[PDB]
């Protein structure tokens, strides 16, 4: 019983974190086998970032200008190359703490854990979701760049995010582990801005099933609705439209609570139009959307 | 930027989690050097927890009856004893992943990270607080017993909680690592229930200071209050009485922001009596109470771990 914003255990990732320094700029790198991955803008100064040319900058660097450090110990860089917005550094020794891993690109609406680091040292872990506009609402002070986001399935770490930038509104932007940005952002100081965000409807519905599972059910009602009718209301409140695929995905939770998906949709429709009237659900006075259906099933069953 | 509730990196604790089994009863244990700690009620298999004389069952149990598992490896139990509500198992191997650690008993209101575990394997990590009524609002399923709560200071792991049980309201009760329960609770089948709880005033104030530190300061006003007048109001909203000791604890955040504690109390008084008017504080619609003053300093000034 109970329900918490829960992160994956971060141990397997902790053992891969390192420090990468170029002149006066230091950030975090990810050390897997004999390769260290970090954001390429490690080779920039605060002034280089106005309009950097990374090809220009990188050619003026040698293996020797990169200072990589695992805790106290320096690692010898014997190769370097760029892969999109990532720098790859080869080191002359392999990380024995390297876990079973893959690099995955996630979709908006999906969640993952972040291991915030500074100077190659793990500081904290938290769970978040990839907003529909491709930003993350993160907790990232300066020097956190290079920190990674991940999921764990069985004994395998799926890396899905590396932190690169903070945007004018205070939200965060980054890449997958191939250096490709989520969203239309770039690694330079531009007036770039995130699109208007939306509420992840599928996740809200999952969260309401979690509430019902934990005994919170005042918001339920006798009505049912059609998908079309629900979408017309949801979209008026800046909620993502719901699809049949998304209804199908809520199936197990529906079965577990014996509340039909379209009945739960009718409940949400009423909450949207009426408000909560000070009341709370699972302790919150607003509808939460950073839990996926699988997250709910995992925690509640 | 951005502000979020964060757990400590759990790696150093993951390396200490094992599986402890007696008969059909399996739960989690904490493996430090050559000792494994787990809830004593693991010997109840699948025995009614009505009125068991743990002493007796324990005197009857053999070393070979405990199945301890660390990964694919079965640890050989070579000794066993009881320490209050905990079982201590001596094994033939000192845990190679033992970090620097200490056992501490925490105060109500204090926060910690919990590594939820099942069958000895870590499944998830979250941050929570010891409620004033001596329970935690955790997230636990069956088989989570033995999961631990902890803080990390530099390179030292301070273990402060081991999970024992769930109460009728869905909240949770457990012990420190000496095996002494938080609250009046016991590890047997009884009519025990959580008492009425309160909002951790010290933490809300710390959180308001965090907001200001982060440039979120709309709720500040130009008035002040006495401690007594603050308590008269706040206690009507089910807040814990604030003491002079709490006021002093907030001192460093008061100094950093230049806002006297009683001045911040007046803003909170105004927030309680008037609501927020749909506005947010640190992106939150409710007054957060699971961040301590030290949590705020740590996250805003610094801070990493070895």
Curated annotation (Swiss-Prot), chain B:
Subcellular location: Host cytoplasm; Host Golgi apparatus
Mutation effect (residue 248 to E): In strain: Isolate BJ04
Domain of life (superkingdom): Viruses
Coiled-coil portions: none
Start and end residues of each Peptidase C30 domain: 1-306
Catalytic residues (UniProt): 41, 145
Cytoplasmic side: 1-306
Catalytic activity: TSAVLQ-|-SGFRK-NH2 and SGVTFQ-|-GKFKK the two peptides corresponding to the two self-cleavage sites of the SARS 3C-like proteinase are the two most reactive peptide substrates. The enzyme exhibits a strong preference for substrates containing Gln at P1 position and Leu at P2 position
Function: Cleaves the C-terminus of replicase polyprotein at 11 sites. Recognizes substrates containing the core sequence [ILMVF]-Q-|-[SGACN]. Also able to bind an ADP-ribose-1''-phosphate (ADRP). May cleave host ATP6V1G1 thereby modifying host vacuoles intracellular pH.
Subunit structure of this chain's protein: Exists as monomer and homodimer. Only the homodimer shows catalytic activity.
Protein name as it appears in the record: 3C-like proteinase nsp5
The organism of origin for this protein: Severe acute respiratory syndrome coronavirus
Full protein stretch here: 3241 to 3546 of 4382
């Amino acid at each position: 019983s109970g329900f918490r914003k829960m992160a994956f255990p971060s141990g397997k990732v902790e053992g891969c974190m390192v420090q990468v320094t170029c002149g006066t700029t230091t950030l975090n790198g990810l050390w897997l086998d004999d390769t260290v991955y970090c954001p390429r803008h490690v080779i920039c100064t605060a002034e280089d970032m106005l309009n950097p040319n990374y090809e220009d900058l990188l050619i003026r660097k040698s293996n020797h200008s990169f200072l990589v450090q695992a805790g106290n110990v320096q690692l010898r860089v014997i190769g370097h190359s760029m892969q999109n917005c990532l720098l790859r550094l080869k080191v002359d020794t392999s990380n024995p703490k390297t876990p079973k891993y893959k690099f995955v690109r996630i979709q908006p609406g999906q969640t993952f854990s972040v291991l915030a680091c500074y100077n190659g040292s793990p500081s904290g872990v938290y769970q978040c979701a990839m907003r529909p506009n491709h930003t993350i609402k993160g907790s990232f002070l300066n020097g956190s760049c290079g920190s990674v986001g991940f999921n764990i399935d069985y004994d395998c770490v799926s890396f899905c995010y590396m932190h690169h930038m903070e945007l004018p509104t205070g939200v965060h932007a980054g890449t997958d582990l191939e250096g490709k940005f989520y969203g239309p952002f770039v690694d330079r100081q531009t007036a770039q801005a995130a699109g208007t965000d939306t509420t992840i409807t599928l996740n809200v519905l999952a969260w309401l099933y979690a509430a019902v599972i934990n005994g919170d059910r005042w918001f339920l009602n006798r009505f049912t609705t059609t998908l079309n009718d629900f979408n017309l209301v949801a979209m008026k409140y800046n909620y993502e439209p719901l699809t049949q695929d998304h209804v199908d995905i809520l199936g197990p939770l529906s079965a577990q609570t014996g509340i039909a998906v379209l009945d739960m949709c009718a409940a949400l429709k009423e909450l949207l139009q009426n408000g909560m009237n000070g009341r709370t659900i699972l302790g919150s006075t607003i509808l939460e959307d950073e839990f996926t259906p699988f997250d709910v099933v995992r925690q509640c069953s």
